[PDB]
Every structure is written in C-alpha cells, then in structure tokens.
Design a protein around this ligand. Structure first.
Ligand SMILES: Cc1[nH]c2ncnc(NC(=O)[C@@H]3CCO[C@@H]3C)c2c1C
Length: 164
C-alpha cells in the first residue's frame, strides 16, 4: 500500500517522490500519466513512465491513436499500466506553453473521479507550464476519490506543503 504520504485533505495525500519509483514499488491499480493529446511520451512524467515500460507504453499508445485519433485537452483514456500498475490513466492537462485554456485543468482532474484510488502527478505542472500551487488547489477542489500525489522536486514539494 501507499506509505510516507502527508495527508492534505480527507482524500488528497502528497509525497516527495518520483512517480516512476513509487509505481514500481506500490504497483497501484491506477497510475496517472501527464499525457499530451497524441500520447507522444517524450519527456517529463510521460517520458519517464514510458522509459520504465521499455517503450511498451508508447507502442500501445500509437496503436490507440491509430484507431481512435487524438484525445481532447482535458480528456483521458485508460490503457495498460504495463509493469508499473494495473492501468495507466492518460490524462491531458492544458499546456500553458501552447496557449491552452488553464480552465481545462479542472476538466482534466475530473477524470480522476472515475477511479477509487490513483497514484498521480500534478497535472499541467512541470514541462506543461502551469503553476504547481494552482494545480494542487484545483486537484483538492475537484477530485473526490483517493489521490496520492507524487512530487519529484523536493523544493517544490516543501513549498506546496508549506503554503497549503
Ligand atoms: C520524471 C518525473 N517523475 C515525476 N514524479 C512526480 N512528479 C513529477 N514532476 C515534478 O515534480 C515537476 C517538476 C517541477 O514541478 C513539477 C511538479 C515528475 C517528473 C517530471
């Protein structure tokens, strides 16, 4: 089970951890990927999760896109979790560096409500360009299911906890 998390609310928990290492250790039912609409897992959380699957995530994802076309910003799809989890919920938060509407971040987090418990990163944070403090607030105010947030950067983790 999940260990070492700091409880923020009734249903939101946080830990300074690499989501890839946390997934390999816990093997949760659902790991969230910080996906883009093409499911091109090049960098950030997506590139790291895909590398941990030996590119199997990318091969599966390319087949999914060839069949279904791209996801919507704010949307998601459930695919295999490979060696990291039972399932991977690929969720597309808005990318501020591309001018995408930050209000779509709430729609992105709503996808989490379809799963009772998830291991997740902060959506739209990191290379997606949004303020992680804002992402955490939208998460707490949107997700009602049990979410275990992994934040890689220790300095940002401390700031997220201390300003909560
Ligand atoms: C490879 C990897 N693994 C992760 N596990 C959890 N969170 C992640 N992301 C961050 O911590 C961002 C860096 C700056 O602030 C963001 C919240 C990652 C990344 C990028």
């Amino acid at each position: 089970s999940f260990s070492g998390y700091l409880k923020l609310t009734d249903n939101v928990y946080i830990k300074n951890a690499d989501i890839v290492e946390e997934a390999k250790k816990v093997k949760p039912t659902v790991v969230v990927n910080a996906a883009n609409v093409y499911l091109k897992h090049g960098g950030g959380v997506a590139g790291a999760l895909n590398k941990a699957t030996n590119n199997a995530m990318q091969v599966e994802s390319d087949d999914y896109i060839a069949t279904n076309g791209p996801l919507k910003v704010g949307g998601s799809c459930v695919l295999s979790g490979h060696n990291l989890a039972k399932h991977c919920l690929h969720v597309v938060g808005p990318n501020v560096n591309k001018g995408e509407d930050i209000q779509l971040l709430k729609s992105a987090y709503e996808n989490f409500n379809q799963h009772e418990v998830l291991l997740a990163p902060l959506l739209s944070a990191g290379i997606f360009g949004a303020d992680p403090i804002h992402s955490l607030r939208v998460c707490v105010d949107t997700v009602r299911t049990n979410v275990y947030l992994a934040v890689f950067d220790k300095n940002l983790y401390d700031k997220l906890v201390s300003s909560f």
